[PDB]
């Protein structure tokens, strides 16, 4: 399971998140075809772990750079912008949305806590207006997907449209989502 | 014929489980076999969606005969949403399109989609809203309805407040306009 993730991850960077079969994976992991079924029941099961592991690397990366900005509205925008500006570059990431269906839950498990973290912080600050830190937190993810699938057929027009939903002044919104974006790595 | 079929399936699925409603048992309804239909319709998935779009065009056409007659646009919208939310938590057939369909969003876009563009665009001219990508606004709205109804299936005023606060309505004035008396429909 250790390598098994990072095996299929590697076989996507330049092979399509959909052209990976156990045969290659198990071999990269260094286990026999009939042993993979001892660490992952399905194949959507592995692909999902490949996803979590991916969001998590950014989930971590975000924390160590963005919540280091005093304004809540920016730490949210910033993280969001990164997530969109990410799905556009990473080949592997593109596949996680316009292809992976658990794309929503997968996000509620890796960023869900982080999302509520920031939506709550910017709330107790009076910066945001939230009447359900969960619905706000889920729509911030339903949106993130639909916004990306569309964009894969903006990393600002989007952020700007989320801060808005979190109550921010329509105008002041597009200004924050449009500020210089710190580096994620 | 592609009328009786979608009806046939609704009863079955609404009472067996969308997941176990073969192309067979469905046509037996509108009396046909299994190999007969695969021809009429391309795949079972289409028919399932034919039931989806069709199940939306119902409440849709219906929501147009009412809500649009309202004055404030942020209401017509919020109101039309609060109605879509209610309907989901109210039907074994609807709350079964979301938590089970991938088209969830895409079909919602084809049917109610435009209607949401129409009303948004308008409130956008009345000065009511502050949208920047009418597309991104109409898709995020539905991607949110699904994402929200799903949570609420494991609140309609609360979601609508958000949906307005997203299109630009005053963060505060948002909830008032949401909590107003929701008119009847179909």
Numbering used by the authors:
A (entry chain A): 32 to 184, 193 to 224
B (entry chain B): 31 to 184, 193 to 224
Paper text:
The crystal structure of the apo-RolR is solved by the molecular replacement method using the N- and C-domains of res-RolR structure as initial models. The structure is refined to 3.6 Å resolution and the statistics are listed in Table 1. At this resolution, the electron density maps are qualified for fitting well to all mainchains and about 1/3 sidechains, which make the reliability to analysis the apo-RolR structure on the mainchain and secondary structure level with some sidechains for a part of residues. The apo-RolR structure shows the similar general fold to that of res-RolR, but the DNA binding domain shows some relative movement in comparison with that in complex res-RolR (2a, 2c). Besides, some subtle distinctions for h3 and g1, the stretch between h1 and h2, are observed, which take a short 310 helix and a loop, respectively. Structural comparison shows that the frameworks of the binding pockets in apo- and res-RolR structures are very similar without obvious conformational change at mainchains. In this way, residues Arg122 and Arg74 restrain the conformations of residues Glu45, Arg46, Val48 and Val51 via hydrogen bonds in the ligand-bound form but not in the ligand-free form after the 10 degree swing.
Here we report the crystal structures of a novel transcriptional repressor RolR and its complex with the regulator resorcinol. In addition, RolR is the sole TetR-type regulator that has been identified for regulation of aromatic catabolism. RolR is an all-helix protein and each subunit is composed of 9 α helices (h1, h2, h4–h10) and two 310 helices for h3 and g1, a stretch between h1 and h2.
